[PDB]
Amino acid sequence: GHQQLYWSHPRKFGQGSRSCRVCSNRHGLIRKYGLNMCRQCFRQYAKDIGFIKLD
Amino acid sequence: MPKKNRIAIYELLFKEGVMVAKKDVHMPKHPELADKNVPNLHVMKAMQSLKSRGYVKEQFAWRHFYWYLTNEGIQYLRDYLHLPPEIVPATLRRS
Amino acid sequence: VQISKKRKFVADGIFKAELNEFLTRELAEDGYSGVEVRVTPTRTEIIILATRTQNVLGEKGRRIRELTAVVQKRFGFPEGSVELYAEKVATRGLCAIAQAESLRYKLLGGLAVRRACYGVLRFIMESGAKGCEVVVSGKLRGQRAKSMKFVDGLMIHSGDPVNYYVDTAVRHVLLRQGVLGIKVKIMLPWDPTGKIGPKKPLPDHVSIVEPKDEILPTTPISEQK
Amino acid sequence: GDSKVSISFENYRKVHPYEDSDSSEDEVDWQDTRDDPYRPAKPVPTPKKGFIGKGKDITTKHDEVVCGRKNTARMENFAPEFQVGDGIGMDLKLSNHVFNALKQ
Amino acid sequence: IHRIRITLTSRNVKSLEKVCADLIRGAKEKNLKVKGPVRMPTKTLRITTRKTPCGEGSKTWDRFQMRIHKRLIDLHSPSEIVKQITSISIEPGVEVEVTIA
RNA sequence: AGUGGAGCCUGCGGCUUAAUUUGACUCAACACGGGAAACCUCACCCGGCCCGGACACGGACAGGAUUGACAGAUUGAUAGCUCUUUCUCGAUUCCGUGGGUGGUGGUGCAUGGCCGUUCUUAGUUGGUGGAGCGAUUUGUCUGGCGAUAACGAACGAGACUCUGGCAUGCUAACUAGUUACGCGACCGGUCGGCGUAACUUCUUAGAGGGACAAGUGGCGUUCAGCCACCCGAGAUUGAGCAAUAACAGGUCUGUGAUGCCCUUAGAUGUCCGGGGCUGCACGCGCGCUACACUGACUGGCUCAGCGUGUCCUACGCCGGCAGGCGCGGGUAACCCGUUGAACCCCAUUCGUGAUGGGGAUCGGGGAUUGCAAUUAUUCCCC
Ligand SMILES: [Zn+2]
């Protein structure tokens, strides 16, 4: 479509304007502390960031 | 797509050999192409056409395309912009 | 104007993750081990840990220049703030993340799974490790997906010790019929001063010093000194 | 050897200023090189005459060393439940009767 | 030149408290009135995920925990000694924020 | 103490619907899929739009291959989407041929990874010695001291790491205070009200100590243990990680992890508009509020900790109420915040009745959130 109608809707709020910064998915996202990763992607990189499971 | 955008892609590729992306059809203007008004979508398709032709090397990493210059692809932009061979990119400047 | 330390140390860990992912993506056929970011406000110095430093540098240093331009352009920090330095890993055998990629290279090279796995197993047993396991699972023989395991040396599976002793490394090899997962867990030694393993002794292993066999008394002797 | 509690001879050590003397730090590196024994052979076609060479150093088709090594290498491609081990690191010459029993 | 503040902050104390003594030692060698290193409280970042990717099992959860130890050390000196003390004792994983007055 | 019995919130089926996507069905599915979905999400239904067909070959193409577009018809759409009206655009192409991409399309009974389960079990494997030609046996132990061809390991269990408990000893504190001395205020006192000198008790967080069946006495093949008392802060909390072997357990719907198959341009790729996921005769669950006098209504008095914060808010004014304004602080033990929570305590009223308990069900206005609240988003009050 043309530019007036191709993105006619505002993607400024809600889960559609929020995607995981690794897997681009819109379910199971964590945005606390500005992670913006998926709940399945964060468990892969938790140690690499440096989260340690203490209790 | 206009030829002005297609030419506007091919400059920054020659100097350093690196062009990036974000994979967003929806987002309208690419940060590195300042005051040239080239959508990132055209960057994606112009370097995807070069990917099947073997002029760039792709390496997808966390929603970011990374593009490269092949050895044979050096001479391809030297025919498009007609850049004479005594002008070297940033590949062989230092050391 | 800065963001909070909570959102800073998080965003620093996300930076050290994407660089490592990208370097793995490119150099999986190089002998890549890891990232070492040292943050200096003049220039951030990133040390590549790889076992063949010549091919990651490429001919005349061409590859390192293009990828340092990549890491310049991606992360948005200004030019003249990145310094990439490839460096040889001290022991290729003990770094299981590098070693769980060379086995993947062999399985891509057409080798039989058992021959390459035993080669990797014996090289890391010989390299100075106290024990290791290599697990290949998937389509090994036909449509049914079986499993293999190569256990030798000693191993520990529970407790804090595991964190600084084994090096769990999981990789996926992409064959014509499917994917095989490879899990290399190398139990490092107690190398104290050594940078081969962690100085800390295993939480249970205790060493008792033998007695310095002193002189049995014979006669009360007063010696002036 | 592997006991958790251990006995230490720290008392009987006389002198050791240079602990890291360059004697035991020999960089063992043979995996990615061509000194790896665990590499493909790049096979040669079998000669039609049934042997290789002339004179007196004729290594024939039915050589016990080559046939045994080929039997072990053929044993390496068994089913996953079958336990093989590391018969390539040490030199095995596995005969046809033994290998045929195992293969069966 | 008074109330210059140095903020050492890292993720684990075994490198933080190591260089914490490497900075207070130079000031005593240079004979500077310095306050003791005060321990601004260790903030614990807590993220509790689900272990499964599916929504299937016994509904078992992870407990991820990141600790940040905050330290403040105070010195009252012209700001030229500050760079020659802090710049030498550089440690990986330990960041040195600094304010002047 | 409950659920099952009441009303209702949300997941399941059955039923309708164009769709009421779907995965999951004993514990090992059913407030699970971070799944509290107005658009997005979103896959599903209806309608419309675009190519984002990379690349290579053949044809067409500059005397144009084309793209975009005012006005009218049509259209939900200032959708050149198609026609009329003819204005733009300079190979950036177009048509077929191969062939790559794109899929939240199908197989989790083709895979990886991760997870769950058996099992939070109490087992698992090796080495040496002796018996037997061998399969095998002893170890991996008969007994109620004593026999004792057996002895040692390793993983698991413990140890460990984190957390709770103790330190008037150490290290320090204007981003926590305390003590004192002045200033002020009101009746020697109270001040979270004001500032400099004492210090780390309180508050912080580092090191190091502290508990190891500890001690004593009774009961026990006096054995592993049990009971009483003492020293004590503690005679010990709560987690995390978790062997060996397995399930044809769950997940292509988390991924640019994925083999094939399908779809690939009147598209299963996008995007956009409206719906649906929430319907409603009925059964199955997790749960909230209740059935009241140990209660409710109305005042006053009140004391936390874990944490978040650019969206958290303080403070004055306007409006009961939600909320607006006007300004300030806070990227953080500095500001919200001395975090002045609720159960609770003290007074009034109601008195065993479908009652003022309990609030479902409905009609109104009123205020924010956001393009848009009608299928009541939420919140106020009748
Ligand atoms: Zn996440």
Swiss-Prot record, chain A:
Keywords: Acetylation, Cytoplasm, Diamond-Blackfan anemia, Disease variant, Endoplasmic reticulum, Metal-binding, Methylation, Phosphoprotein, Ribonucleoprotein, Ribosomal protein, Zinc. The modification Omega-N-methylarginine is found at residue 11. The modification N6-acetyllysine is found at residue 47. It comes from the Eukaryota. Binds 1 zinc ion per subunit. The modification Phosphoserine is found at residue 8. GO terms for biological process: cytoplasmic translation; translation. Zn(2+) binds at residues 20, 23, 38, 41. The keyword Nucleotide-binding does not apply. Belongs to the universal ribosomal protein uS14 family. This is Small ribosomal subunit protein uS14. It comes from Homo sapiens (Human).
Swiss-Prot record, chain B:
One of its GO terms (molecular function) is structural constituent of ribosome. It comes from the Eukaryota. Keywords: Cytoplasm, Diamond-Blackfan anemia, Isopeptide bond, Methylation, Nucleus, Phosphoprotein, Ribonucleoprotein, Ribosomal protein, Ubl conjugation. One of its GO terms (cellular component) is synapse. Methylated by PRMT5. Methylation is necessary for its interaction with NPS1, its localization in the granular component (GC) region of the nucleolus, for the proper assembly of ribosomes, protein synthesis and optimal cell proliferation. Monoubiquitinated by ZNF598 when a ribosome has stalled during translation of poly(A) sequences, leading to preclude synthesis of a long poly-lysine tail and initiate the ribosome quality control (RQC) pathway to degrade the potentially detrimental aberrant nascent polypeptide. Deubiquitinated by OTUD3 and USP21, antagonizing ZNF598 activity. Deubiquitinated by OTUD1, antagonizing ZNF598 activity and stimulating formation of polysomes: deubiquitination by OTUD1 promotes stability and translation of a subset mRNAs with a high abundance of rare codons can limit the translation rate. It is found in: Cytoplasm; Nucleus, Nucleolus. GO terms for biological process: cytoplasmic translation; translation. The modification Phosphotyrosine is found at residue 10. The keyword Chloroplast does not apply. Belongs to the eukaryotic ribosomal protein eS10 family. Component of the small ribosomal subunit. The methylated form interacts with NPM1. The chain holds residues 3 to 97 of 165 of the full protein.
From Swiss-Prot, chain C:
GO terms for cellular component: cytoplasm; cytosol; cytosolic ribosome; cytosolic small ribosomal subunit; endoplasmic reticulum; extracellular exosome; focal adhesion; membrane. It catalyses: 2'-deoxyribonucleotide-(2'-deoxyribose 5'-phosphate)-2'-deoxyribonucleotide-DNA = a 3'-end 2'-deoxyribonucleotide-(2,3-dehydro-2,3-deoxyribose 5'-phosphate)-DNA + a 5'-end 5'-phospho-2'-deoxyribonucleoside-DNA + H(+). It is an enzyme of class 4 (lyase). It is found in: Cytoplasm; Nucleus; Nucleus, Nucleolus; Mitochondrion inner membrane. GO terms for molecular function: class I DNA-(apurinic or apyrimidinic site) endonuclease activity; damaged DNA binding; DNA binding; DNA endonuclease activity; DNA-(apurinic or apyrimidinic site) endonuclease activity; DNA-binding transcription factor binding; enzyme binding; Hsp70 protein binding. It is a peripheral membrane protein. The modification Phosphoserine is found at residues 4, 33, 102, 207, 222. There is a cross-link at residue 212 (Glycyl lysine isopeptide (Lys-Gly) (interchain with G-Cter in SUMO2)). Changing residue 212 to R: No effect on sumoylation. Abolishes sumoylation. Abolished ubiquitination by RNF10 in response to ribosome stalling and deubiquitination by USP10. Its EC number is 4.2.99.18. Residues 19-90 form the KH type-2 domain. Signal peptide: none annotated. This is Small ribosomal subunit protein uS3. It comes from Homo sapiens. The lineage of its organism: Eukaryota, Metazoa, Chordata, Craniata, Vertebrata. The gene is RPS3.
From Swiss-Prot, chain D:
Widely expressed. Residues 17-55 are annotated as: Disordered. It is found in: Cytoplasm. Residues 20-30 have a biased composition (Acidic residues). Autophosphorylated (in vitro). Interacts with CASP10. Interacts with IRF3; RIOK3 probably mediates the interaction of TBK1 with IRF3. Associated with 40S pre-ribosomal particles. Belongs to the protein kinase superfamily. RIO-type Ser/Thr kinase family. Involved in regulation of type I interferon (IFN)-dependent immune response which plays a critical role in the innate immune response against DNA and RNA viruses. May act as an adapter protein essential for the recruitment of TBK1 to IRF3. Phosphorylates IFIH1 on 'Ser-828' interfering with IFIH1 filament assembly on long dsRNA and resulting in attenuated IFIH1-signaling. Can inhibit CASP10 isoform 7-mediated activation of the NF-kappaB signaling pathway. May play a role in the biogenesis of the 40S ribosomal subunit. Involved in the processing of 21S pre-rRNA to the mature 18S rRNA. This is Serine/threonine-protein kinase RIO3. It comes from Homo sapiens. The lineage of its organism: Eukaryota, Metazoa, Chordata, Craniata, Vertebrata. The chain holds residues 105 to 208 of 519 of the full protein.
